[PDB]
Every structure is written in structure tokens, then in C-alpha cells.
């Protein structure tokens, strides 16, 4: 595989509440493998795993059991998949 | 009975006869035998190994000829050539982009070139003139020539060239033969590039290494797994001489008649040079040279006692030093053993010891700049040493361990452990010292971020900074200007302050995403950026910046310092200030201290058990 964008529909939840219509989330799967040898290179480091590139954000109205009006909420999801690095949390091990 | 062809087969070094086809193996058991040359007079065969990442030698006259490890710390040594006159050894590296040189015993590594080298490949020598020749097939394919001393480097081919894989000389006719693997030909030229005339025009699948003998050419080809051979002058007689090869690489004609005897300008006295007597084209045809990072004195012959200003670095799996006396900024891989996760580091100009920590070995360790004398200082009761500091005056060692959230102190050789700062501390790391004034400085993390200060005994702990603090990972002091410098990774910013708490201005704000390593030395401040895997410097008074090495993974922490020059004194130096164990200086005067299990006596100097 080569780091494609797989899709599947899901509902969004706040526990007892549930969104009216669903939402197609995307999941970065695939195998962003290491680049092969340069054509005139001698044969025989980095880690470029398939990671969410850009994110999207949609508004979905939330619905809760009888007695309450349809609350509204905004949720952000995955849009594109690329192969980048990872540098955020700062610790030792 | 005629030219024996020595070639590297990725797994062993073989030797064919040009007349007939029984190939005798020279050295087997190799993993990726790439380039090879020889020193017939000394009877040695050198070769490279891109998988073991090293260059080895063996005496072919001696039976059961055990190998001799010559180099280690290379990335992709694609080319190699021996200097059978000045007893020197030149090689290239297509990844680190440099061309080094050393003696035969692997000693005295000097980087001769690091500029404008994309993917250098093959290299050839002519020591009787003092000219080295090499090729490059990367961004701008070219064939360069230069003095074997590292001078008069001139690009001699740049037109109609793409994959100049192989290269050799015709000493009898003073010409230059190279082969292009994509442009599919072999051309000759005079030793400067003039009268480039064609030899073999077609019929070359993918050659890699070319060699010459008498009026006959010999080269390896990759797509055919064989050794072709043609006439040196005419393109006629395209032949197969040795076919069905595993994976042929570099080939030379193996005979003394390819390394002609000539007179050495270095003579018996090594040309008077202290270290390296390299060949040169300019009179007197040699030039004295110093190893990487060490500058040459006014003699033009006598090297300096090591490199003066020096920048020691800690990565995760290795330790590396970078000399500051030369613009090459070559990071010498400090030859050490069992370094799983090196964190903090410091130096001691008095003894020449490098004190570094490790959170998976759980030990504070100590070594020379060379890498000899690797010894464990503190072995047990150690969790996460994110910061270490050397009191070069009182001969004591300080460190911070956030696993136990405490700061302790011993003498430089591990003895006399005493817990100084135990309480009111949240993930502390960096630590610098000022023994002349008698204050210690340190930082902790973002929950209650601060840069606290106390004496060397754990007294009068006064919190220095409390505002606009995020991830203060580094700390450094400029003693001559009474100001301390720190650096933050959460605020993505680095600022300065005076010890009086007077000025507090931001130095650089633009592109400092995440600094962990941090040090200061004489109007320059060096830092180690995570997320960019780079190291730069900043001018103190100015704000200029200079990338010294970019793209280096697993970067941690560094401290810059001088070698064999130290400053500062206080009462603790004189016979340990009369203390039996610990001499902890502070403005009130020194204070003798005992470890655990011992107590302080009436004289407030000695220590015995109860
Ligand atoms: C040291 O070795 C050289 C060259 O030997 C060659 O390489 C080794 C690995 C063996 O495979 C040998 O069979 C090869 O020839 C010897 O030089 C030879 O000298 C004479 C006998 C002649 O055949 C000449 O063409 C060769 O170059 C050399 O004699 C040897 N040293 C000693 C003391 O024997
Ligand atoms: C270094 O270790 C050595 C022994 O391994 C020690 O040096 C001497 O140790 C004895 C025994 O405690 C003391 O009485 C001496 O005073 C020490 N010598 C000096 C010059 O102080 C010591 O534990 C460590 N430190 C030093 C400085 O030697
Ligand atoms: C740290 O914060 C406390 C209260 O937030 C404040 O009183 C104190 O002055 C701060 N530290 C310094 C050095 O001012
Ligand atoms: Mg060569
Ligand atoms: Mg390169």
C-alpha cells in the first residue's frame, strides 16, 4: 500500500447525545515505505509514516433523548494523508 | 604472468589473471567491499565497506593475513586511493560530502574538502606531481583536480558529462581516462582537461571502475557482471576477460609498475612537519598539515597542542566534538562504547575529562576528549540526569535528577555524595555554576516554571525568574559580563538577563522551535534545536547567526569550552579549604560538609562516623 485515504462513515457522540446525520471520517492507512536506491547509487535513517496532513472541520447538529432541543456542535476531522515526521512532546524517554 | 587485476566483489577481494581464468581470493568474509587500492612497496591492500562503514587494510604477503581496522565513523565511503609516496590515504564519502586524508595507520584524519561535493565517487592520485583527481555525478556532474595538500582545487571537466563513474591515469603518457555510465563512452585527456578526445564511443552498459596497464584498458561493468577490456589508444577490441562476477566494484592493475618509485620531498625528517607531510604541487612540493579542527602555527610546520576552543556535543547514541578553530566544523565521532541515551554533558579543562549522563544506563560517566579512560562515576540511585555541571575550582560534580526530583553533589570521581536540593522541585533539568561568587543556577519545567538560584550548599534558595517562563531547558553564564543567558522551548524564544535582575531582553524570537542544548563561550551562544535537528550560533553583542551543522538526528545537549585554559579561584582550592570531604563555597565563606553516615565535628572541617 502507498499511504492512501480510507473512508468510513460514523456517528459522532457526546455520550447520550448523537448526531442527526453521520460523517465520513478518513483514516491514514497505507505503507509509506522508504525510497528505493538512486539509479547509480551504491547499495547496502528517517521515519516517514503515513500521517494526517491537513484537517477539515464540519458543523453537525447533536440530538439528545426526548425532552431537549437539538444542540449544535462543531467537530474537526482528517482531510489528507502525507508522510511527515513527529516533534511535539518534550521529554527524555 | 601479465597484469593481475585486483577487484572488490562486495563480499571478498579477488585477483584475476589477464592472460587466461582462475581468480584467487585475497580477503573473504566482507559484507560490502566497495573501493580498493594498494601500496605495493609496503605490500598492503586497502579497501572500503559501505555496510560496515569503515576502511580496512591487510598485508597480502603475510598468510592468514588478519585485517586491520583503519577507520570508523564514516557513512558511505564510495571511493578510495592510496598515496604510495607520501604514505598517505585519501577517500571520499557520497553522503557526508567530504574528502578526508590520513596516514596508513588511520591516524591524523584531516578533512581536505567539504564544499560543493554532492555525490563524489572515484579518486586517483599522482604523487610525483602532487595532484589528486576525483569525480562527482550528483547535481552538477564534474571531474575536479586539486593538490594533495588541499590547495589549488579547480574543476577540470564540466561539459558533456553525467555519470563519471570510473577514473584512472596513464603515468607513462601523462593522460587521464574516465568513463561515463549514462553518456556511454570512455574519453581521455591531458592532466588538465585539454585535448579531450574519444576512445570508446559506444557499447557501455553501466561501467563503474576503470584501470589501465600497458596499452590495454580494463574496467568493471554492473549490468553485465563482468570485466571488459579494450585497447588504450583505439576503441578497437571490446572484450570480455572475466565474466559471471557476483557484484564487481573497484579494480586496479596490480603490479609495482603502476606505482613508480620517485623521490619524496618530505625526506627522512617528514619534511620537518609535526604531524602530516602531504604532497603538494607548489614548491617545495610538500605542505605540513594538522588533523581535523587543529590549526597550524606560524612555523607552517608545527601543529598546535590540540584544538583551543572546542564544542563538545551529546547525541543519543554517540558523543561528538566539534572544533571551533576551523571553518570546517567537522563533528568527530568520539570513539566510545555503550552509550544508549546520552543527555547532559560538561567538561573539565584541568584534567581534560568529559562528564556526561545517560537515563537508560542510569549512570554519570567520564572520558577524555579522545574517548579513552571511559569510567563510571555514579552508578546507582540515578533516574533521569537532565543536567550536569562541573565545579572546576572545588573539584566537585553537580547534577539534577528529575526521577528523584533532587540535586546532589560529589567529588569529580564519584566519592562523597550529598543531597543538596530535595524539596519544592518539579521536573528540574539544566544547571550551571559560578564558583567565584558561590551561586548555583538551575531551571525546572512548565507547571511552576522558574530559574531558581542558591549557594553551593543548598542555602538561601532565591527564585530568580518567575514571569513568562515555559520550557526553560538550557542555561549558561557569561562571567566576564555578569549576565546569564537562558532559553525556552515552549515560548519558542530565547532571552538574556543580568545577575542583578537588571535587564531582561529577548535575543532571538524568530525560528527557535525547540532548544534543548545550550551553552555560551566568548561572544557566541550555541544551541541544539529539536524538530530541526540543527545547531547554530548567535553573536552576543550582535544577533547574527551561523548554521554550523544542520540535519543531525537525535540531538541532545552541548557545552562549549576551552582546552587547558581555566579561570576563577576561591578559598576552596587551597588544600580543599581544609575540609576533610566537601568544600561548598558561598559568599559567607566556605562550608565544609560531610556525606551521609558521617557528621560534622566541632571544628566544622573534618568528618567522622558517630
Ligand atoms: C609478496 O607478494 C608479491 C605479489 O604476490 C601476489 O599477490 C599474492 C596475494 C599472491 O596471490 C601471489 O601469488 C601474487 O603473485 C610477490 O611478487 C611476485 O614476485 C615474483 C615471484 C613474480 O611472480 C612477480 O610477478 C610477483 O609480483 C612477492 O614475491 C611476495 N613476497 C615474497 C617475499 O615472496
Ligand atoms: C578520588 O578517589 C581517590 C581514591 O579512589 C580518593 O583520593 C584520596 O582518597 C583518600 C581516602 O578517602 C583521602 O584521604 C585523600 O585525601 C584523597 N586524595 C585527595 C588528593 O584528596 C578520593 O576519594 C577521590 N578524590 C581525590 C581528590 O582524590
Ligand atoms: C513567583 O510568584 C509569586 C506569586 O505568584 C510572586 O510573589 C513572586 O514574586 C514570584 N517570583 C519572583 C522571583 O518574583
Ligand atoms: Mg582509486
Ligand atoms: Mg550528498
Residue numbers in the entry:
A (entry chain C): 78 to 121, 129 to 177
B (entry chain A): 19 to 38, 41 to 630
Task: Tell me, in the authors' exact words, what the paper reports.
Low-density lipoprotein receptor-related protein 6 (LRP6) is a coreceptor of the β-catenin-dependent Wnt signaling pathway. As a member of the LDL receptor family, LRP6 is a single-pass transmembrane protein with a large extracellular domain (ECD) consisting of four repeating units (E1, E2, E3, and E4), each of which has a YWTD β-propeller domain flanked by an epidermal growth factor-like domain. The LRP6 ectodomain binds Wnt proteins, as well as Wnt inhibitors such as sclerostin (SOST), which negatively regulates Wnt signaling in osteocytes. SOST inhibits new bone formation and growth by binding to LRP5/6, thereby inhibiting canonical Wnt signaling in osteoblasts.
The crystal structure of a complex between LRP6 E1E2 and SOSTtr177 (a C-terminal 37-amino acid truncation mutant of SOST) suggested that the C-terminal region of SOST might contribute to LRP6 binding. The mFo-DFc difference electron density map calculated after rigid body fitting of the MR solution revealed clear density for SOST NXI motif at the top surface of LRP6 E1. In our structure, R121 made close contacts with the E73 side chain and the backbone carbonyls of V70 and L95 in LRP6 E1. The shortened C-tail of our SOSTtr177 construct (169-RLTRFHNQS-177) facilitated model building, as we observed a clear side-chain density for H174 at the center of LRP6 E2, where H174 stably interacts with polar residues of LRP6 E2. H174 of SOST made close contacts with R449, W465, W491, N493, and H534 of LRP6. Unexpectedly, in contrast to LRP6 E1, LRP6 E2 showed conformational changes upon SOST binding in that residues at the center of the LRP6 E2 propeller were rearranged to accommodate the insertion of SOST H174. The ligand-binding pocket of the SOST C-tail-bound LRP6 E2 (consisting of W491, N493, R449, and H534) appears remarkably similar to that of the SOST loop 2-bound LRP6 E1. A possibility that a second SOST molecule bound LRP6 E2 was excluded by the fact that 1:1 heterodimer formation was observed for the LRP6 E1E2–SOSTtr177 complex using multi-angle light scattering (MALS) analysis. However, the current structure clearly indicates that SOST interacts with both LRP6 E1 and E2 through loop 2 and C-tail, respectively. First, the SOST loop 2–LRP6 E1 interaction is more extensive than the SOST C-terminal tail–LRP6 E2 interaction (~540 Å2 versus ~400 Å2, respectively).
